[PDB]
Amino acid sequence: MRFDSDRYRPTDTYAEVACDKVCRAYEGLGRESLLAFLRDLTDPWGELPVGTPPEDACWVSIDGMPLETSVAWAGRKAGVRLSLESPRGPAKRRMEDGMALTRRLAGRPGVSVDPCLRVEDLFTDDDPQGYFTIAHAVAWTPRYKIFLNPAVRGREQAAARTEEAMIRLGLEQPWRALTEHLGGAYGPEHEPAALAMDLVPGDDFRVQVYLAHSGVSAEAIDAKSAVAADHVPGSFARALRGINGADDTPEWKRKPPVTAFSFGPGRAVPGATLYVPMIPVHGSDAAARDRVAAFLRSEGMDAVGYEAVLDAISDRSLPESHTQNFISYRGGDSPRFSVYLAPGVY
């Protein structure tokens, strides 16, 4: 990986970059305290110089940075979020960094890490495999999330570890409903690629299971979420076809669409949100932007806001920028849209 940035000095720290990106995201939506918060949150690696890329790229950003900025639109409001993952190595050290951060979140206001701690052993190991083990996100209105890799000991065990976690968390009923709807097994068609967890107590607790959809059409992807609590028939197929076009490009096959199924206490079936791959299915952020903006407009959603965030946060002109990871989408009466962005520094 090569450091390459028109905006940052190689001596700027990861924490300082995270602060700048988060601020500019808010600018797009229309500081010393924040930086202190983020330096704290990213301890100790937050102090490291961005000019030296980690020896192993982080799973959390497509440019391999330990940071990914997110803006999420929902219920007529917009919020900024930051995902983070230690850039240290080897994988065992990266893992243990995340374990430490989970425990340092435990005491914070409104935070509950108990459900995380109940299933942590399923997603950690002395000899972790895969591209990641532990990552987190913070969201301001501060609320925290953790991301976990079900393939920590191989893709082969992903479904089993995911299932065992769902059962421990008391979510076997909607997990069974999903599993049955999917045909009873979890192959490449709908493969558990990540699990996430809102670190909060109560009925607001939720778990997301992200399923990657390899070798399957827009229409069949849409059908997989007909079991969901709020899925407009055809809405995912229209998003995938409208934004991302042909499903036979090498780039498509390299980065398949993902559905995040969301589970919570007292909810017999999961929710569903569509993750539409951006880079490298599109040749640049500008090309992605035009196609996403067209879709948002035809859905009556706020494309002006999406483009404002893109322009504020991006360091290079968009036809030469490749920072959009996914957008996420749910249609219906309570629609949702989010954009996920690499810093664009490596």
Side-chain angles (χ1 to χ4, degrees):
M1 285 179 298
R2 299 189 185 178
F3 175 74
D4 180 11
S5 179
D6 310 339
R7 179 159 167 89
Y8 301 106
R9 293 190 157 96
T11 46
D12 298 333
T13 71
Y14 285 128
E16 290 174 335
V17 173
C19 187
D20 187 54
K21 290 292 184 177
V22 165
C23 285
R24 290 161 62 201
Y26 278 110
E27 286 174 37
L29 291 177
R31 182 166 178 112
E32 249 304 326
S33 323
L34 175 56
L35 179 63
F37 174 85
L38 292 176
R39 286 178 56 182
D40 184 84
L41 193 60
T42 54
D43 184 84
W45 58 262
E47 305 312 307
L48 290 176
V50 68
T52 306
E55 320 184 291
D56 304 311
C58 302
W59 162 96
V60 71
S61 173
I62 62 177
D63 71 347
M65 283 279 285
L67 313 158
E68 182 187 68
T69 316
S70 190
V71 182
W73 286 263
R76 297 175 63 175
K77 57 173 169 49
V80 184
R81 311 94 54 92
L82 170 79
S83 305
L84 56 104
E85 177 191 13
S86 169
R88 307 211 273 160
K92 189 170 195 298
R93 175 166 296 124
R94 180 165 297 181
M95 181 185 77
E96 291 176 338
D97 281 356
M99 304 182 67
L101 175 60
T102 293
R103 282 142 180 89
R104 296 180 50 235
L105 299 181
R108 296 186 180 197
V111 176
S112 173
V113 299
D114 298 351
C116 182
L117 292 184
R118 282 210 182 83
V119 307
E120 188 182 57
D121 65 281
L122 294 168
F123 307 98
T124 53
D125 199 79
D126 258 13
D127 189 21
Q129 314 166 2
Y131 295 109
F132 83 105
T133 58
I134 294 175
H136 297 86
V138 52
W140 302 268
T141 47
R143 302 178 162 260
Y144 305 92
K145 185 195 300 211
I146 186 171
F147 301 90
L148 297 158
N149 185 8
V152 60
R153 294 293 309 177
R155 300 167 67 171
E156 45 272 36
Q157 297 180 33
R161 296 175 174 264
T162 300
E163 175 157 301
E164 190 174 343
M166 298 305 291
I167 290 173
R168 295 188 188 171
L169 294 164
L171 298 167
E172 183 166 12
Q173 178 188 39
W175 172 255
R176 280 194 319 251
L178 179 63
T179 309
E180 296 176 59
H181 181 63
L182 295 182
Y186 285 90
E189 254 202 292
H190 44 256
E191 177 179 351
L195 189 144
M197 196 184 293
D198 296 354
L199 300 167
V200 297
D203 284 328
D204 291 354
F205 175 66
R206 85 177 176 140
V207 177
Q208 296 159 294
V209 182
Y210 301 75
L211 302 178
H213 303 302
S214 182
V216 50
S217 79
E219 290 71 23
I221 289 174
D222 195 278
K224 290 177 181 300
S225 75
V227 70
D230 181 358
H231 184 255
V232 181
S235 60
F236 286 2
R238 282 182 285 284
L240 283 177
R241 293 188 309 245
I243 304 171
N244 276 20
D247 61 10
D248 61 299
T249 65
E251 291 88 7
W252 178 298
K253 287 185 164 166
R254 188 203 326 181
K255 191 173 180 170
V258 167
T259 302
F261 290 95
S262 52
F263 307 78
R267 303 184 165 81
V269 291
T273 297
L274 176 68
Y275 281 68
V276 183
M278 293 283 105
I279 305 305
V281 176
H282 304 265
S284 72
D285 281 329
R289 175 207 57 208
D290 295 352
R291 301 195 62 79
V292 172
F295 176 76
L296 292 175
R297 289 175 49 84
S298 71
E299 287 293 293
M301 301 173 72
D302 181 11
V304 171
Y306 159 64
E307 177 164 1
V309 162
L310 253 184
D311 291 333
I313 205 175
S314 301
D315 305 324
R316 292 241 286 262
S317 69
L318 297 186
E320 302 160 1
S321 174
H322 303 84
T323 65
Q324 283 172 111
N325 184 13
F326 295 82
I327 64 89
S328 65
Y329 164 71
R330 177 189 293 168
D333 291 323
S334 299
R336 299 186 188 177
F337 170 85
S338 303
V339 60
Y340 303 84
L341 299 125
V345 168
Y346 300 148

